[PDB]
Design a protein around this ligand. Structure first.
Ligand SMILES: COc1cccc(Cl)c1CC(=O)N1CCC[C@H](C(N)=O)C1
Ligand SMILES: [Zn+2]
Length: 139
């Protein structure tokens, strides 16, 4: 579990979105595992606007923050699941690190702010859904 609260928006993994999230829908992309819904209160999360490849993410399964090196956002193959058929997920960044299914939602940050959220993992790797290109989150 986990969300990014920036201004009047809540950004969550599309596979984990609630009824409230779909009833207050702004944007959703199944191929990115992202869903953005509207909130009635203000959010103070800063979104990073950068090309950073290092940062720190929260791993709920270890109750710990881990520093990571990660790749550029890209189309990576993701295996089938109860949420999606086997497909290419776009805007995905991979890093070597620990993750478990309940780890989706954990925030990845750099010196400039929120980079993205945990969306995939397995085999000693963690995948992050990038949010740095969604410029409308701050406007
Ligand atoms: C079950 O595989 C692992 C293993 C380690 C870590 C993790 Cl987060 C998972 C879960 C995983 O990657 N999923 C399940 C939920 C939807 C994700 C997606 N974005 O398509 C794909
Ligand atoms: Zn950065």
């Amino acid at each position: 579990s986990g969300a990014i609260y920036v201004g009047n928006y809540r950004v969550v993994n599309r596979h984990l979105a609630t009824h409230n999230d779909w009833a207050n829908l702004v944007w959703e992309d199944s191929s990115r595992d992202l869903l953005v819904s509207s909130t009635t209160a203000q959010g103070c999360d800063t979104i990073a606007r950068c090309d950073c490849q290092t940062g720190v993410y929260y791993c709920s399964s270890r109750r710990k923050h881990y520093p990571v090196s990660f790749s550029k956002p890209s189309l990576i193959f993701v295996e089938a699941s109860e949420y999606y058929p086997a497909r290419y997920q776009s805007h995905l960044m991979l890093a070597v690190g620990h993750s478990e299914p309940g780890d989706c939602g954990g925030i990845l940050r750099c010196q400039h702010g929120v980079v993205g959220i945990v969306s995939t993992g397995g085999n000693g790797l963690v995948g992050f859904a990038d949010v740095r290109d969604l410029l409308w989150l701050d406007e």
